[PDB]
Write a protein that binds this ligand. Structure first.
Ligand SMILES: CC(=O)N[C@H]1[C@H](O[C@H]2[C@H](O)[C@H]3N=C(C)S[C@H]3O[C@@H]2CO)O[C@H](CO)[C@@H](O)[C@@H]1O
Length: 538
């Protein structure tokens, strides 16, 4: 007689190759990379002979075997590839093998190979597009948007993007290194806790709870090895294998450490830590560098040096050489990109015609041209062109594109930015010829989340009725709303200015469009990016 049929013992079924320690706040303790998951299976034999060999099978294939020595047994073995496996215990003797019923086990890896695909329906006004224009359609998802903004990875209209940027991955450093974070309550202290025992100038995760642990759709079971934004991005990657998901390093409040990378010791340490970050988190497809800005004039008034352009070029070159190596080891295509000032004065601090040789795309931040940071000089915050009243306006999309083109940047590298938010002023007064921009303001407009800034969702839903005047400036390619009684003025992108930008990209053979930030759109802005770049509906 063959052995009796074993019964798998109840026990944990989810294991991880990269493990997240559930009680640690320092990135170095939080994340344990192993060569393989340590899997454990037990069984009982309730009827028959226990056989002479016990085997654990994963989809029929032996991962462990040993002597079958009693009515119950335990196998501890390593599994080096992620997935969901039909596991069985089989008991064998000379007369045959008898296999248990299959139990599914999870062997988690950060490519999301153990996860069901996160395929969610489009929400709000989002309509389906195919990505067939061959142009970039990008947007940023922000890590902290899962809190007050309540906008999670399952709400991303992912089929409508080619590029999804994760803002932001910080670089470790305390006093003197990340001083700009101190302007945000608790933010500098959160980074120091995350970076404790970790060298300055290495990357980390700013909010490991939101990134890895917060229950979210598809990752709510307590034993799920990855949860939060990363666990959902892994599952999104299963649903959208051609979507490029890039970690964005820097941004407004996390750019200070770039200013030190003229020291090759620090720069080498940074690049090596980026490599390790991509080996650890396999769902990411490259790296986006958002250094605001070489030369300074970013958040920190004390940083910026004439050397920064040279540092930037060297950095892009070294990141490229690291990515070409990773790409060789893995067989994957990795991308290197950068979000950059669209102001000619910042553009001319960098030789982009040299750095473009290392880079896949340049995200031109053709927005924030004007806003409540200047109450005196009012203007269109994200316009294509100068307006009729001031044809020599410095800060326009076209002036940034032409600055790059004049350096000798190739048109196909350049991705034009659109805003999914408005900036505005209150108390605008002293304007002439019915153009509020010719006046001056007394303060910022009341914002959705902070003063002077309104989600595109709120503009469309609250500010396109009642007393609000609406004008589309067809010279600048720029809409604006104005409430004269309070003097509230908001400058923003809408479906039409986005269509102008998209048409311009096609005419000038540029690379495509990107937007900041995805949670703020109701679908109008992203629908228009897709349509205007010539993506097919459906
Ligand atoms: C209006 C807003 O959302 N402000 C954010 C800020 O967003 C910057 C961003 O850092 C900069 N980087 C890009 C990439 S696009 C570009 O513009 C946006 C909007 O002006 O980000 C910081 C953190 O860097 C937040 O504190 C702030 O909420």
């Amino acid at each position: 007689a063959a052995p009796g049929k074993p019964t798998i013992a109840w026990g944990n079924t989810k294991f991880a190759i990269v493990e997240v320690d559930q009680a640690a706040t320092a990135y170095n303790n939080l994340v344990k990379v192993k060569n393989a998951a340590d899997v454990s299976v037990s069984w009982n034999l309730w009827n028959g002979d226990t056989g002479t060999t016990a085997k654990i099978l994963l989809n029929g294939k032996e991962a462990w075997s040993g002597p079958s020595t009693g009515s119950s047994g335990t196998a501890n073995f390593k599994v080096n590839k992620g997935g969901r496996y039909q596991m069985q215990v089989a008991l064998c003797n000379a007369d045959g093998c008898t296999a248990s019923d299959a139990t599914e086990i999870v062997v988690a890896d950060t490519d999301g190979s153990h996860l069901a695909p996160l395929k969610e329906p489009l929400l709000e006004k989002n309509k389906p597009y195919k990505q067939n224009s061959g142009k970039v359609v990008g947007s940023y998802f922000v890590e902290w948007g899962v809190y007050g903004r309540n906008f999670t990875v399952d709400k991303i209209p992912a089929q409508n993007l080619t590029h999804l940027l994760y803002g932001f991955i910080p670089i470790c450093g305390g006093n003197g290194i990340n001083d700009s974070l101190k302007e945000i309550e608790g933010s500098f202290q959160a980074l120091q806790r995350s970076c404790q025992g970790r060298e300055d100038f290495k990357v980390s995760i700013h909010d490991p709870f939101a990134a890895l642990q917060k229950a979210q759709k598809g990752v709510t079971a307590w034993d799920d090895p990855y949860k939060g934004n990363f666990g959902q991005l892994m599952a999104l990657k299963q649903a959208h294998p051609d979507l490029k998901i890039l970690p964005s390093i820097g941004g407004w409040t996390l750019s200070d450490p770039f200013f030190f990378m003229g020291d090759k010791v620090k720069r080498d340490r940074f690049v090596g830590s980026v490599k390790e970050f991509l080996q650890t988190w396999k769902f990411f497809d490259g790296v986006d560098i958002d250094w605001e800005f070489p030369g300074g004039k970013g958040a920190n008034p004390n940083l910026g040096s004439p050397q920064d352009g040279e540092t930037y070029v060297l950095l892009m070159k070294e990141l490229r050489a690291m990515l070409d190596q990773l790409s060789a080891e893995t067989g994957r295509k990795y991308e290197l990109t950068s979000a950059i000032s669209a102001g000619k004065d910042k553009i001319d601090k960098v030789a982009y015609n040299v750095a473009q040789n290392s880079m896949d795309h340049i995200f031109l931040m053709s927005y924030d041209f004007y806003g409540a940071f200047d109450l005196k000089n009012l203007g269109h915050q994200t316009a294509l062109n100068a307006p009729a009243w001031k044809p020599d306006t410095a800060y326009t999309t076209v002036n940034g594109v032409n600055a790059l083109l004049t350096q000798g940047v190739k048109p196909g590298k350049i991705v034009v930015g659109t805003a999914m938010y408005g900036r505005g002023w209150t108390g605008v007064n002293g304007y002439q010829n019915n153009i509020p921009f010719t006046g001056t303001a007394t303060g910022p407009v009341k914002g959705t989340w902070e003063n002077g800034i309104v989600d595109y969702r709120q503009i469309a839903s609250q500010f396109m009725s009642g007393e609000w005047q609406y004008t589309y400036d067809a010279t600048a390619e720029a809409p604006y709303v104005f409430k004269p009684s309070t003097g509230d003025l908001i400058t923003f992108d809408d479906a039409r200015s986005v269509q102008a930008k998209g048409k311009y990209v096609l005419d000038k053979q540029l690379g495509g469009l990107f937007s900041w930030e995805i949670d703020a759109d109701n679908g109008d802005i992203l629908n228009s990016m897709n349509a205007s770049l010539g993506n097919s509906a459906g």
